[PDB]
Input
Amino acid sequence: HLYPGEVCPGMDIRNNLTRLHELENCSVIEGHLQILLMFKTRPEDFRDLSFPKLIMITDYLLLFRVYGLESLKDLFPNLTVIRGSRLFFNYALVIFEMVHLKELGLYNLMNITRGSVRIEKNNELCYLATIDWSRILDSVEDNYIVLNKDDNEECGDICPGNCPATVINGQFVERCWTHSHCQKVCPTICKSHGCTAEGLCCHSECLGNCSQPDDPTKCVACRNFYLDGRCVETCPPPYYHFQDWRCVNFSFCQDLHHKCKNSRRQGCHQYVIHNNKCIPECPSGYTMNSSNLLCTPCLGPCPKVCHLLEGEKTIDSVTSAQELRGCTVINGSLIINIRGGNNLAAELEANLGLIEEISGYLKIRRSYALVSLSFFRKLRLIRGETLEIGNYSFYALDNQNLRQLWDWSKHNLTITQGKLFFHYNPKLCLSEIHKMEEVSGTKGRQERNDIALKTNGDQASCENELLKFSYIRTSFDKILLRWEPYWPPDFRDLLGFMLFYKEAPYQNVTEFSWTVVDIDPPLRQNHPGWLMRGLKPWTQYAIFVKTLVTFSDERRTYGAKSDIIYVQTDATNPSVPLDPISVSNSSSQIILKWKPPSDPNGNITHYLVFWERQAEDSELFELDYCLKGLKLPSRSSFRKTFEDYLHNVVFVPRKHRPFEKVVNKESLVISGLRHFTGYRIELQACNQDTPEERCSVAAYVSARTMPEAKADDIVGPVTHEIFENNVVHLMWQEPKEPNGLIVLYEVSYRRYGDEELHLCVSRKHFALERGCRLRGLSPGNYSVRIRATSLAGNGSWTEPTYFYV
Amino acid sequence: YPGEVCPGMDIRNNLTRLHELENCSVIEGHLQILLMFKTRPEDFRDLSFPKLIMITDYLLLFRVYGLESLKDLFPNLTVIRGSRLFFNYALVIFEMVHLKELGLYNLMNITRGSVRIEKNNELCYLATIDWSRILDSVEDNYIVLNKDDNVERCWTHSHCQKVCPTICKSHGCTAEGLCCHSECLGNCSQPDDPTKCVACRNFYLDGRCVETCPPPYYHFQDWRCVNFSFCQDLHHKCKNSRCHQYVIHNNKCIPECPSGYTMNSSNLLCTPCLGPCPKVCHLGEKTIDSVTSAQELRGCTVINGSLIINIRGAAELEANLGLIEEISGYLKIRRSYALVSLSFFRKLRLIRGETLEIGNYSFYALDNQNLRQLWDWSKHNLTITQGKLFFHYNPKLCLSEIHKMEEVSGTKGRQERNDIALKTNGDQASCENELLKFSYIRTSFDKILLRWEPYWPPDFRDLLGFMLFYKEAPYQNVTEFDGQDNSWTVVDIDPPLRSNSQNHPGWLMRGLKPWTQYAIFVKTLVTFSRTYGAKSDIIYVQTDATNPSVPLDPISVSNSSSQIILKWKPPSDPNGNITHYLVFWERQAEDSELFELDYCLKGLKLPSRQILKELEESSFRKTFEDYLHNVVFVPRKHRPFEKVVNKESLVISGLRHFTGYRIELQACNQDTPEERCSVAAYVSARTMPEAKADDIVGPVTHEIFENNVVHLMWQEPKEPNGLIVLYEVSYRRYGDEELHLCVSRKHFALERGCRLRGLSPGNYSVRIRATSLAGNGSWTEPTYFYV
Amino acid sequence: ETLCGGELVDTLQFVCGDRGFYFSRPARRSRGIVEECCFRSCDLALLETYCATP
Amino acid sequence: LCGGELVDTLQFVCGDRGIVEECCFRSCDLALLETYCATPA
Amino acid sequence: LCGGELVDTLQFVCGDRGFYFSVEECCFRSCDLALLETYCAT
Output
């Protein structure tokens, strides 16, 4: 759609709301809107006020200590895109010291062309994390939001979601503006061109929102340009662009320039025509034409002077630098002072860099996000007419990340007067400052303490010279290093090597943890070298060296270093096998489980496992198994330095078990084993097999198989012999294959119609007596059952022996 | 004795220098012979040293090839005095090849020390040597890894060791075995003759063995007598040599004066030295790089030189150094990275500086960064005789300490312009000397809080919370922020809210050691614009005491049937000066389960008894505040108990034999006002049983029936060892064996003793023994009755 | 007495109060409020001049 | 390194050719070990 | 460290002044003696 209403050049509202009615009939604003400093206001007063008309704000929106307001949704329900051409301290939208502000309420804002949002110190705001700035801005990192109600306290952001939710870091979350409004999200294909309710794409040139999908005429904002409602990407003549959002006929710019010239406003600009653009003033290399408002290029080298008030300016934020955009000659001094934390070099070189000459001095103080002054693209000369105090022309102080001064491969420079000053620049190099000194031509204008010899680059790596590892020797835990001796022009300047190292499991290693070893410089052959200690076997390590020199400022000796070098130790005997367990799942099957050694000490080739069968206890064959307690178990110089100083004086200073190779397997099954019998098993991890196999200590373990069933039960019938004295000697073949062994045989013999008596036939009772014997039995039918008790347990009672004595 | 002095010397790499020993008789030293590899047996049958007799210190042989018997080389070696014991040993012979026999038939005794024989694949004839006869001590020998291990006493096949009579314990036995002189040792040319002594038992003097050294001859190495002239000559010889500077004391030429003694230039006597007065060390210049360089500085007290220290990097140097008290020359600190302060030099109070550092400097300091303090200049005294001070590139030493430097050392006018730099020192040192006052404190046994006066820099936003430092203070003094390049557990505080009344920052601690001394201080934290920090005095607070811990290791011993001796150890946490221990004892009733168990049946067994980021964040916030403010506003145009005092032991009497007693032990660090006594310590101890308690007391009364039934009545030992589980009876009839019977507690109760039925005719016997907890008692007298 | 931001606004609208603050047009001169009241202590007149009507 | 394992160090650094007080007690200084080589052994 | 155990500290910090329950600012968050100052009401 078109933009009904006026254009409302940027204003501010102060001290009461009665002025706000100036926004009655306009949907766009040329400039910035400031609502701030409300004291005698209350929510019922805000509830009446509203402005559905406003759509897009040119420069910025600022709210600062407005009382009685709780939610902006009822004020600006249609703000869609913030142009942000001229920011407010590198921030497109500032929400500061909002008391009573409960929730934002900007559910129609889509994009901010250039800028950032800073909301802080409100202690009344929540529903903050439930919004996604990524779909709103392009540089999320530049945002700065702290000290709210949502963060310190736990204001619940209760909202439907019904509404889209998406991931931000590692989990999904709803993207909601209000308790009744939620962020408009749509497919990334039409990244900014807009998207209707049903998800259909808007026009290509369109932006944010549209009523008719893929239709330029029925949009609410379009990224390119505006003209006559139906906006076009680039309007043709006779329409010249203006404020980078709308183009007008020549008559409009002509009459407004005349209105500025006749009414001598201190702020109005004599607009010019240049490349079909009615800009406030065209840059150097052009001259205003009185006849036609075009500014024709000049027939001479006249730069655009950019005079400074009070001969000095401070650059701290984007808005500070934008005043100097297009300027090329500065009749003053410049003080870069960027209290930051986030990089700004982009917009600085975008707006600065076109400057060439500085009449006064330059000074870079306390800046932190600066990485290199290279963003001063075309600066060539520093006349330094306005000499800074202490007779200084170039200055520096406490710049924590000032890495590079300028690209001296191609960039010239010239300093007329004044001397330097450098202090507290931990990320600089004396090489760089010396290079600037040579290029400047002020080489004879350097004096003591104008260049701190220590604070300039405390922790960097720009020794500019290389060292070579003369010899390397490897071993298990000792690595011998040797390198070419280094000798600056004066050997006294060299003060010692530093060998830095760190274990390196991978290849990605930085430069400049990182354990250090000091090396005494050698005496002028005799490679300094060093021998390593305390290594873990079969592990890679990154190693390099570094030189140390004196101040050496009069000369240009900066030491040297070696490149980062990877080298790994050797393999050795592995560690003990881990988790050795043995469970016999069957009478002959045993499962063995183990884990790889805690120190494999190289690629584990295999496991070596041996086993055998123990022998039963001898005492188990000569134990009384029916006496009390018959429970059978079921299964400091001293001596150490004596030889040490002995060697000191002598040396003196000179003036078969079954086994297999288990490969790639932590679980074994063993068969062919005697049922209910203990077995001895050992295992050794082996990280080297074919070349004189190297294996660790044996993994001792023992396990007994599951018992059988028929083994305990007695095999063979029962025989009896009766003598004249009614004594019955009983024979029965024992289970010669029991579960381990049989300790006793229980004999349950009864009379006919009488009680049943139990007799013990132990191993010695069965063997020594050769069977068993019953004495003192009266005539009558009998019934004798025999049960064998083995190691596992008891057997089966034999058939009753029917006989008469 | 015809021979040479023969100081101890060593032979290696050949046998050539061995010939030097040809003209020697008695060694005044030790022989250490090793590195014999190109050595063959045939080259050693033509060499001998019969003149050699006695070795003073010790003998070591190593890696000997070719030798098989030392009887040839050393036939007449007699005694090793062991005046200098080789680590309580006098002979170490190691790693020989071809050496099969000893051959030292002429060795009879060793004055002190023992022998070490090891790793000798060839040596034999070890079982025919008596060490006790030779050496007075045989428990310290260590003879392993020889040929014998892998009775006639004889050295070799042709040499016997010889056994002196027991009466000749140290005189020695002559050819007839007669005891020699008292001063004779091992052997003698003539029995009972000091002149003919082969070895001197105590001392040697011109061919005569004597017990002591008459003046002016002093006891030289406890083996001879040497006058002052020769001892002083040896002193001078060491004086102009590399050393054992000999000094005479107690008629002994000791190689050094002992503690509290000093040699005088007039006489080598060790006069009682004045107090510590340890030593003086000499150089004129010496640098110290690390621990190793300062290692030999141990004990150096007065330095007749100069010290230039450069430590490329703590308590290790505190061990090495700190024993220094004065320096003659100039002192310099240069580029010592790992130096935080100079507290190690505890005793440095005066410097002479007669030698001056380049530029006539007495104290030079250059390119030292991590230096923070020098000393406790409130109490430490320092003096400078003359010179100048150099301070440059000392970024972490604020100028207050430098000002105190000359005011304590008295060098106010000694320093000149640019001697002390202003802009190169104390750049990082931000001492601002604003004092913080502590509001109040109050302490609980477990915890303690802390509140102090408020403080605000001119911009109240610039304050970024407080740092709180604390740790334990053993004694009443402690340093501050020294550590190393540092313990001192720290905790951060957020700034208090502005009250525009005034709140206080405050803080409560979390966990601590009760009844201990803590040292605490609070440091501010503010971003430089200027530096407006603050600091507080080191405050010592004592946490109040509480109930102590449990006394350790309670042990009880039954030294008697009524005496039980108790011992324990002090509690882990005294939590106050222990007033006493509280002890309770109570008789423990024995297990009543015995009273219903018939032990006569099976079961006869009876038991018996990192920061820059947040600072910059605050700066960012403040600068945005200021930008907004500038742009917005525009102006117009009970139990028997005991209180054991100061004792870790106890004894309890009046206890029955073989009786358990439960013992309860607390420690009470408080005495009168409701003693804080910890939880109990419990231990049960049983007294030793009486020997007569289990023995049956009382004659056996028996009742013969018509059908030969006996009713045995006997009186049990009413005071047994705890109780009697059963009574064992051994009753025997004439012509029969000693039948056995068991009368249980129930059997003795209901049967009133025993009731035996069906006795065969004849004369029986009745012997009954009680089985108490201690064991069987005594059998009763045999009751003979004819049934 | 020295005062800086945060409490500076609270100092305003009380010494000035009621009526608003004068604001015509931008017409940055490095002397606005901070280097006159936060950096260095200021009197009442330097604050009274920031009112609108008087 | 102490007695016995410093034999490995001397095997390494000395190659084909006071003690223990320097490595077991003090710091093993490497260059000290080098001059210890018994070239005329 | 929160409800149940800290009650002694609650008696500790203020003594004979008395508080009202709530703790989830100290066994998940931290106690800093400021909230301890506040909860104990006069």
Q: What stands out?
A: Chains A and E do not touch (no CB pair under 8 Å). The domain at 578-635+656-704 of chain A is CATH 2.60.40.10 (Immunoglobulin-like).
